[PDB]
Amino acid sequence: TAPILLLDGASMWFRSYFGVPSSIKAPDGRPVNAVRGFIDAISTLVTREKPRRLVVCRDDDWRPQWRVDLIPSYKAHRVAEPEPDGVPDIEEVPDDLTPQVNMILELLDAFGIPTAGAAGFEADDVLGTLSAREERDPVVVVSGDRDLLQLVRDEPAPQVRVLYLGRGLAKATKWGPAEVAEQYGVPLDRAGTAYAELALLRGDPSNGLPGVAGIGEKTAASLLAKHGSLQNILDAAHDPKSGLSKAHRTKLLGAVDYIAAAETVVRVATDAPVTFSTPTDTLPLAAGDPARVAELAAAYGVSSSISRLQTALDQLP
Numbered sequence: 460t461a462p463i464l465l466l467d468g469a470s471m472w473f474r475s476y477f478g479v480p481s482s483i484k485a486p487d488g489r490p491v492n493a494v495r496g497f498i499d500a501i502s503t504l505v506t507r508e509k510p511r512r513l514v515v516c517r518d519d520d521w522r523p524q525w526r527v528d529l530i531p532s533y534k535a536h537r538v539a540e541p542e543p544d545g546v547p548d549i550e551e552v553p554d555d556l557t558p559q560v561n562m563i564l565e566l567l568d569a570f571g572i573p574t575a576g577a578a579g580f581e582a583d584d585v586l587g588t589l590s591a592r593e594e595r596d597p598v599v600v601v602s603g604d605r606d607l608l609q610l611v612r613d614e615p616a617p618q619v620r621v622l623y624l625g626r627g628l629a630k631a632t633k634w635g636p637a638e639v640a641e642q643y644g645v646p647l648d649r650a651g652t653a654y655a656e657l658a659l660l661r662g663d664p665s666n667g668l669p670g671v672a673g674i675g676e677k678t679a680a681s682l683l684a685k686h687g688s689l690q691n692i693l694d695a696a697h698d699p700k701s702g703l704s705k706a707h708r709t710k711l712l713g714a715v716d717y718i719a720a721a722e723t724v725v726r727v728a729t730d731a732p733v734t735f736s737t738p739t740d741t742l743p744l745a746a747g748d749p750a751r752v753a754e755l756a757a758a759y760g761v762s763s764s765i766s767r768l769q770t771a772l773d774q775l776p
């Protein structure tokens with residue numbers, strides 16, 4: 460059967476912002492390069508993957524307070540203005556990109572393309588929750604964010620793949636457990652979860668996470684190779700006769716608190732309370748509100764992109 464596409468919205472429209480020139484502008488002069496690129500990526504995906512189901516996943520909270528409480532440096536270098544509890548922090552985002560996010564969300568809503576979010580969670584968590592719950596169709600998670608490699612799955616069916624956007628969409632290929640195992644040296648039988656344990660240990664500068672000092676990617680992969688899992692590695696450290704080196708024991712034991720905190724920060728949630736903007740995740744084959752879509756697309760200078768999307772939809776069997 461055809462896959463369900465789960466789109467990491469912010470990953471994709473940030474990529475469109477930096478991959479489409481800012482001289483692409485609306486009639487009022489505001490850049491719409493991210494709008495154009497994001498709509499064009501949806502049309503490309505519809506044509507390449509021919510889904511019947513498609514969801515754009517939102518960041519209802521891009522920097523959840525529960526993660527910051529565990530690790531205060533989490534995404535700290537990306538905050539423009541921190542906001543008190545209950546209110547998402549203001550992310551440092553180019554001034555001419557935020558209005559384009561509003562334009563995109565307005566078009567998706569008027570078209571009826573499903574969007575999903577969960578209060579207090581990231582799009583990463585929405586993607587992890589929807590891919591964990593999927594029982595009917597193969598899942599394609601579309602993102603430039605290597606965090607989501609932890610979601611790859613062969614069994615139980617259906618499979619989960621990440622269409623990874625690190626080199627852009629034209630060059631993107633589907634990552635499964637084999638690809639993550641081959642490119643990162645984690646065990647194949649639990650490749651996705653072990654990738655998250657690898658990232659926890661080595662650190663993640665784009666998320667503001669330091670990792671465990673002294674355990675680089677090479678060491679963490681080999682430790683996972685020999686012991687199979689992070690839990691087994693901590694067991695080897697806590698047990699004073701295991702074959703774990705004393706230097707490794709010192710680095711791991713000196714980080715027990717960070718490791719316990721980081722575990723829930725690094726893993727994406729799989730049971731977030733996701734809500735949809737639409738009744739189902741079915742991809743509409745025509746605009747839910749065509750007059751509003753035409754008025755918005757003209758106002759946002761992307762009428763030809765919307766027309767291209769409708770042609771791709773028209774070609775779906």
Ligand SMILES: [Mn+2]
Pocket residue numbers: 524541542543544546547548
């Ligand atoms: Mn805050």
Ligand SMILES: [Mn+2]
Pocket residue numbers: 469470581582583604
């Ligand atoms: Mn994200």
Ligand SMILES: [Mn+2]
Pocket residue numbers: 583604606
């Ligand atoms: Mn992420």
